[PDB]
């Protein structure tokens, strides 16, 4: 309800940033990859690859789907 609406708003604004802020995605992926170090040697670099892979598909499914559908995917809507 409010959670579905809040999810839809967040997705909407992320789509807007991705489409109008050429620095947004890179800065976000780079920041998350840095947090991956928290996992320590071995696991950290896997986490980094994971983030690299997830961002590609997230930007892809988000550049192709509507926010409500993206939110339903993770159980925040419907």
**Partner that binds at residue 63, options ligand 3PE, a second copy, none, CB closer than 5 to 8 Å by kind:** none
Q: Which one, of 50, 67, 74, 59, lies nearest residue 24 by Cα?
A: 59
- Report the alpha-carbon distance of residue 36 to residue 40 in Å, rounded: 8
Nearer to ligand 3PE, 9 or 75 (CB): 75
Q: Which one, of 45, 73, 70, lies nearest residue 59 by Cα?
A: 70
In this chain, which of 19, 22, 35, 65 binds a second copy, going by CB under 8 A? 35
Strands in the chain per DSSP E: none
Interface with a second copy (CB under 8 A), residue total 36
Residues of this chain that interact with ligand 3PE (CB under 6 A) are 25, 28-29, 32, 35-36, 38-39, 43, 46-47, 50-51, 54-55, 57-59, 61, 65, 73
């Amino acid at each position: 309800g409010d959670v579905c609406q809040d999810c839809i708003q967040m997705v909407t604004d992320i789509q807007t940033a991705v489409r109008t802020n050429s620095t947004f995605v890179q800065a976000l992926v780079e920041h998350v990859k840095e947090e991956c170090d928290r996992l320590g040697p071995g696991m950290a670099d896997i986490c980094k690859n994971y983030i690299s892979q997830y961002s590609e598909i997230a930007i892809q499914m988000m550049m192709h789907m509507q926010p409500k559908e993206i939110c339903a995917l993770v159980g925040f809507c419907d």
